[PDB]
Every structure is written in C-alpha cells, then in structure tokens.
C-alpha cells in the first residue's frame, strides 16, 4: 500500500502543471516508515520548491537518549541535540550516495558546525515519538506539463532510501554520544560564571579552521591548545562523567598579544563562537564563553539612532549632543562606540575585541598627542579609560587581541602571548614593563544601566509604507521592502537560518504595529530567563535594561514559543528554514535599520 | 514636417507590442531642432527602456567657448566640460518643470558633482557641430498592446520641450563660465608638481557636505577654508585670468591632527576627490591633489593574489611567504598592506590615509609592546617605519589624518591641527613635543619599483566558464557571472557610470583572452601619458611598473579611444551610461576579483 502517490503522478503525467494543486494538504504513505504531506505546491516549475513535511518513526530509545520515556518531559537541550544529529545524518546520506539517484530537486536546510535549535527537524509526539523533517521539492515539469515520472523518481528513489537508511536506520549509539557531548558543552558553559570564569579553553582544542568555507578544523599541522599552568583548571562533565582541563579566564580584562599571524585572532574567533555548542569533532568543542558575549568592532558607514555614546564621545563642537546620538553614516570610532553601547543595552557581560578590526582612535591615545591636542579639545575618550569602570562597576569583562601598544598592560588582569600558535601567560612580564616605563574608582561611573530608549514603530516604518516583503539574504543581510539591513559585520551570526529568524521578528513588529510594541515590551520585561540558541532557557544577569531591549527579548521569546515559525504576513518563509538566534542579534539587526526611530 | 513619428505611433496604437521593432535604426525629425534615432527597441513593456540617440544643433560659438572654429582641434578638457554643462542643463529642465508632462519613462545618466568625460553627451561634427544625447525610453504598452498616445506624449511633450528649451536654448554665457572654471581647475592641478606641491586647498573652499546623499556643499554654518600663513601660496589661473590663494602642501609627509569631529576627515575627503574637477559652485573647487592620489584604508575579508607585501608583512611563522602573497580572506593589516602595494604598482605618487579607517596594527607600535614581543617575533612592520623610504627613495608622498599617537611627529614635514573647523600649522609644536620625549637612509629600500606580476586570464577566468554577463551594480559592485567584486571600499569611485566603465574593461579581458593580454600590455607599456577622468591626457611619472599595470593602462587607453563604449560581448550596456575612470580604479577592481590569478 505505498503506490497511491505514484498512482497520482502517473494519472497526471503530461497534464497541465496547475493540476498539482490537488496534492495540497494530502498525506501519502510512500514506504513502510515514510509519510509525506504536501504543505504547499509550486504554481509553476520555475517557482521555489513545493514544501513538504516528511515523517518517520522514532526508532531509538527515548529513555536511553533523552533520559525520559515521556517526550514532553525531555530536557530541551538533549531534544535539540537529537534533532541536530538527525539533520546531519540526513545530509550525510547524500554525501555517501545513499539515494538511488540525486535529482538536485530536494532542498533541506544544511546545518553549520554549530548545534542550534532549528524548525528543520522536530522530534514530536506520534500520530512514542516520530521525526518530522521539512523540505522543499522542485516538482519537475516539461514546459507547462507535469513530469510525473520525474516526481516519482524523487519521492520513491531519493527521499525514501535516504529516510529509511539514514533517519529510520540512524546509529543509536552515535546519536547518544552526540547528545551526551552537547549536553556536557551546555553544562560546562553554564558553570563558568559560578566557578569564577568568563571563558574556558579546553586542552587539546584545535582552533584554526581549514582553508576556505567549510569551517571544519584545520586537518594538518595544527597545534593543539595547551593552557599556561598558571591558568589551567578542571571541570567535571556530568553526562559523560569525564573531567576536562584547560585555560580558565577570570573576570576583568584579558589581553591576547603576540605577533601578527601567530594565532591571536584564531583564538579570539573560537571565543566569539563559544556561545554555541559544536558538533563533537569540531575541534572547538569545550571552548566556551559567557553566553552573552559580543564581538565588538568598527563598522564605518552604519546608521545609529538614539544611542547614548557619551561615555566614549562627548563635548562635540557647537553643542552637538551624543546622549541620544543619531547618524546616517557613522565613522570608525562612532560605529564602534555605538556597537559597544548597543551590546551593553542588550545585556552583554563580555566584550570581545580584536585590535585589527577596531577603530584606532577609540582604542589608543599616547602622551605625545595629548600635549599637541589637549583632552578637552578631543571628544573621543579611548576604551582604555573606560574598561575598568565597565568591569568594576558593571561586571562587564573584556577580552582583547592587541599588538600595537602596551597602554592596556596596567589595566589587564591577564596578559597572554601567542607565538607560533603556542600560548604563554606573560602577565608578570607585562606588569614589569608597565611599572618600569612612564605610564599614568569610587568616581561616578559614566555608564547608565537604566537605558532610556523605546522603539518608535510609526517613525521607523512609515517611510517604507510608501506585498511588504521581509526576507533574509544568506548570512549577509535582510531585505526589508526596499531597505537593506547589512548584517555582514554582525560577526556571531553563523547560519542563514538565523537571518531568517531575525527577519521574522522584524516583520512581526511591522505587522503588529501599535499594540505589539507594549506587549512584547511587557513580555520581555517580565522574563527572568531567555532561550539560548541551543534551546535551553538560561538566567539573565546584569542590570542593563531598556524598553527597546525588553521588546526585542519579548519578540525572541515569542518566536521560541512558536517553534521558530512566526508565520507573520510580511515574512513568508518555507517551513523548516529557520535557526535560533539570541535576542542580542535580533536587536543588532533592528539597530542597523536605516529608517530606525527610537524615542525617550 | 515633424509628424511622421506621431503618425507611426498612431498607426500602431493597440497593435501587438512586438511591432515596435520596425523603429529600429530609424531617425525622426520630431521638431525643428530635434532628431531622434531608435538604436534599440524593447522586446516588451517590462524590459529596460529602448535606447535612443537624440540630436540637436550646437547653437553656441565654438570660437568663444572652445577657442577654435574647428571642433576636431578643440582642447578635450573644454569639450568635456561643455558636454558636462549640457548634461546638467538637460537635468535642470526636469527640476524646473520644463516638460509639459514628466512621464517617468525617460532615463538619462545623472552626473555627480564632478566633471567627468561620459558617453552620455557628445559634441560631434554635424550631419558646425551638433549635440548628441543618449537616453533609454520605456515605450508604454497596455498589456501586450502598444500605447501609441503614451509614446507620442513622451517624445513630443517631454523630450522636445526639454531639448528645445534646455539644450538648443542653453545659456551660452553660463556655458562659457563653466568651461573656463573647469579648464582652470585642470591647469591648477597639472601645475602642482612643477611648483613643488602635492596638494593645494583654495581659500574660501566649503569642504563639508550637506546632510544625506546630495554631496552638495553644506549650506549652513560652514566655516570657509583659510590657509595657515606659513603654507599660503598663490596660483594664477590663465583662463579666467584670476589669481587664487590657499594652502599648498609640499612633498613628504603631512599629518592632519585635531579632535574627532573637528574637521580632519572632511578635509581629507575633499583631498581624495581632488583628482576630479568639480561643478563651479561645488565648494571644493580649486581643492586639487596629485592626479595619481589613492585613498588607502583597511579592508578586511577582501582577496589578494600575487602581491608583494613583504615591506609591511614578512618573516611569517613556518616559512610562509609574502613576496607573492595570496589570500582569500585578508585581515585588517594584510588588506591595508596589499592596498598600499597595489596602489604603488598602479603608479600612485600620493597616499591619503585616515587613521579612523586604517588597521591599528599597521599604523602604530609603541616601545612597551616591543619589549614584550620583540620585533623579530612580529611579522608586521608599521607604516611609520616605511613612510620616509617611500618618500625619499621613490618620491611617494603621504597625507594622513591622525588622532591617537605622536609617533609620526619626527617623520612629518608638516603637522596641521583642525579645531572647530579652523586649521593651524603646528609643525613647530609637534617637533618640540617629539624632541622633548623619549622617541627614537642610504639603507637599501625595501620597495621594488620593477614589480614582477602578470595577469593570468586562464586561471582567473576558467572557474567562471563552468551568456557570461558582466554588469555594474550602482557604485558598490560588479557582477561578473556568478562572482561579485565588492568595490564599496574603493573610495574614489564617484559615479555609477565609472563602475560601468570598469565592467566593460573586465569583460574586454574575458572576451579577448589569450592575445588581448600581451596586446594591452604592450599598448599600455608604450604610453607616456594616460587620459584623466576629465578627458585630458597627462604625463605618467614614477618608476613603479609591471605587466599587470601596463595591461590595465592599455585597457583604459583603448576604452578612451572607443569613447567609453567598448561593446564587448560579455558586457552589454545601453549606450550613454558610462563615465571615465582612472586605470587605477580599473586595476583596483581586478585586484579584488576572487578568482584572480597572477603569475611572475
Ligand atoms: N593552532 C594552530 N595551528 C595551526 N595553524 C594555526 C593555529 N592557530 C592559527 N593558525 C593559522 O595561522 C594563520 C594566522 O593566524 P591568526 O590568529 O590570523 O594570527 P593574528 O590574528 O595573530 O594575525 C591562520 O591561517 C591560522 O589558520
Ligand atoms: N568647515 C566646516 N564647517 C561646518 N561643518 C564642518 C566643517 N568641516 C567639517 N564639518 C562637520 O563636522 C562634522 C565632523 O567632521 P569630521 O571631519 O568628520 O571630523 P573628524 O574626521 O575630525 O572626526 C561633520 O558632520 C562635518 O560635516
Ligand atoms: Mg589578526
Ligand atoms: Mg561591506
Ligand atoms: Mg574621523
């Protein structure tokens, strides 16, 4: 009894392509363990693929893998990891030539090295559990006639063997080990703060990435990571029962110095993605940071609206103000200042900076220049004069790659040096250098944690009313009607599915606007915890808050409640192409909308 | 006898849109002083507009305006300026509501503030001179039927009144003054080097730009430019007979310091566009620099192929080399080093740098850091240790906006300080600061003027053979088949017509490839002069040369000989949408092609 779908396609062979519409909302049993529901049908063969939901039984033990017999009680971190393993096993089927033929007609979201919650694969209650996988399938045509034999080949000779062999026939022991490792990664990260660290870098980690675009670990001539002994510490990982050792970094300022190309940025990049759990053989596994960490850099030409950058830029010429700063075209230093103050507003407790991509004028200032141009005639206060304030008064740590100056040596708690990819702790040497040279707080903090900033939907969106489609373009941008929001320098976005999540939230605001703003604001404001990209709901620290950030957190939480598919009118996406992202990245995107208007 | 075109459109009213093809290559006299030739006809009403050539008599005195009675003998600088004035007068007609109705169907290239040679408007021999203007016109349809009345309205009630009133009826005295001023700008710039300067900034200049996208001068609260007396000098402008006074900058290193937002970058931006003549009321008029000046900045993530960056980055770990450097993903410092060495190869004798957009690690290094990480373990040599070499041994000057360090004070010839938009010469103060502090050449130059670098068309293009359309996207990029060449940080591109010129040259190489490489190389190598963007053919200085740059100069020269319309197979453009660009920007684009391959 698996032939009805084939019998259908045989019946419409050669007929007008429009007649495919009759598949809409029908479900077919196409093999013993595979059902397929058509969620939508392409209007013609050149349109984007028809969306389907494919369903298989869950054949592994829930008790062994998820530690419960009841699916609804399962730890979301383990459920997410299991969905991520199934997704990888599906794609591995293609790589290993499991389909009898590969049509090129099937599109399923391809995961990065990171283990994110995604709408692609769901472990759900059976219609005991089943597995749903969402895909788009280009139903072939000859001109405007249906290629029924071509369609039959896709379903019966491609999707069926893949799902039967790679999903129904998945290796349960590999699945279990994947899920243990991910759960231990998440428990390790969540133990950092309590143990007195902002970051941990496992011994044996392979940090550099291979050549090109795979983001896979460098396969040859890689120097495994080895902690300086002065910083080495050990964590027990309860799910695998293992003990891991590596470099712990304490709160305060850590500097990473060393020659260009000696491994500094590679270490820092592993830290930036340390907010995500990784596939087990990734190399950066158990390299973790505070989940609110934000990569800060210069970003000249971006727009800014209503951000208080007065801690870094103040006293402009001609009474111009920076307490509610607005620009359509930021410089290096003003973009970086705005990036910092926006990250603080969205709650980041750890700033990660790389001198190679910061604005010099915000990083450094030497004594010679101050004699020529006195501080009172220089609007810009460098980060070195604010970094201790952030840390001591607001508990915000900083990790900074540096190479050009020793001006941070006195402020630093730890100074690392990378040389030929080997790391040393050189804190004592640096302090001696600073003390033997000619370098230079119950003082009111310049940082105001109660930020006064509210989204103005009317002013933000009105320009654009003059369908209203919001869509994600790769990982690089969002088209918002005729506007383009450039995300290419929001560096902790790792999957195009996350840009789709962002687009949905921005459209939600557009489609909901008057009442949705206060509602999301109230909802986000009442939250004590937010979902991480790994599906786990963590406690929110830090005193920084604002209506704008609470509103963003409410959107993000609401998208999580809707399983990453908001289905709002102005953002139409095929189902199963969205990946979880922090409310931080959703706010980063709205901050960059060129028509943005905010108000006090 | 002007009704035949109307009679045609009346005859095809309501007929199939395909029948418009019969207009191809026909010419119509649509008023006493206006002819219109259809160069191509849209295949349907949704296609890009049909291209037309519109021709009017030249009614001003050639002798008065161009100083000759024979068009072919006219100075190209004056001919270009006259074409640019006609183009502006045409667009001004729209602004002033001259057409009886504005259909929105007519597209003619819109000039920037700069006076470039363009294929849009030509002063040509009469079929005594006439004026050609190239346009695209969307011939309206109702569904797939011809709207003949709509077309008649465009030609007879829009283009005819515009051309009759604004081109045939142009103000000859305004035209003359435009042409005098432009010619004086060009003569001023070409006199710089001989007089001992690399830049001149006229007194009375208004440098800041108004809010937003117009690039017009700031209309309110602008502080006119006033030279420090120590640098003030005077030039006589022979065409107007006037004498202009302003700040002359001598060869060597000039620093521009002062607080953020006190006017430094605004001065530097006026210098970067000082390679172009400007419309007379622009504000930056008579602000000129060496015509080979290049804006240098950091540009992380660009690709580089076969560039010797060894003067800045050398002695990497593990015998990696930088004498023929290759990367798919440059850092801040490596992109900036490559930008510098590529500009030198293409012949630039003046580097313009803004600290706010440079890579810190290439700009600066202090003594404290050198004690922690000795110079021998640091691949990166900062620009401050190479800037005197460039200047003394190769005659390459530098003008740099700085704010973070006094480390360049000893090397500088001139130190300017901007405060509240007022400028001072503070060279003496800076030198005293450096001498009273603790700061630190028949030495072999590290810079090799005989660059060894050849374009490899086979390796560069082969990937992309797997129509081959090359096109310009605004001023931001070129689509080269499925490749995208990002030009958004090639900052002296000022018109989308220039990106079209670039695209034509790149397609020329693609379409011509084996034999075209040696031919262009030989042609560019033999040139003693190249055409400027203003249409004037200047003498090429400096010893830097390579096969790659000669090849680029040959392409640029050949495009100039073809009046900015190459008509190569892989780059199809409507006629009249191209603007002159230096061979420097054409090479900048090819340098950034991600499949680029070069060879020694
Ligand atoms: N542990 C390692 N083993 C092998 N190669 C490495 C390692 N760490 C970094 N690299 C490689 O060295 C090169 C330069 O590294 P990077 O950290 O960019 O240096 P920096 O940021 O100090 O300029 C990169 O191509 C990187 O992949
Ligand atoms: N001569 C002037 N008159 C009026 N405004 C000016 C002048 N020069 C610059 N400005 C304005 O001051 C602001 C900051 O100028 P900018 O040169 O960017 O400073 P910096 O590069 O020193 O940070 C800009 O908006 C600019 O338009
Ligand atoms: Mg680096
Ligand atoms: Mg960009
Ligand atoms: Mg600036």
Numbering used by the authors:
A (entry chain A), B (entry chain A): 50 to 176, 183 to 495, 501 to 526, 532 to 665
What does the paper say about this structure?
One such protein, MRB1590, was originally identified in MRB1 complexes immunoprecipitated or tandem affinity purified with GAP1/GAP2 (21). In vivo experiments suggest that MRB1590 effects editing of several mitochondrial mRNA transcripts, in particular that encoding subunit 6 of ATPase synthase (A6). Structural studies showed that MRB1590 contains an ABC-like ATPase domain, which is embedded between N- and C-terminal domains that harbor novel folds. We show that residues in the basic N-terminal domain are involved in RNA binding and crystal structures capturing open and closed states of MRB1590 suggest possible mechanisms for how this protein may participate in RNA editing processes.
To try and gain insight into the molecular basis for the MRB1590–ADP interaction with RNA, we obtained a structure of MRB1590-ADP in the presence of poly-U15 RNA to 2.05 Å resolution. The notable consequence of the structural changes found in the MRB1590 structure obtained in the presence of RNA is that the attached N-domains are significantly rotated relative to the rest of the protein. As a result the central cleft or pore located between the N-domains adopts an ‘open’ state. The average distance between N-domains in the RNA bound or open conformation is ∼28 Å compared to ∼3 Å in the closed state.
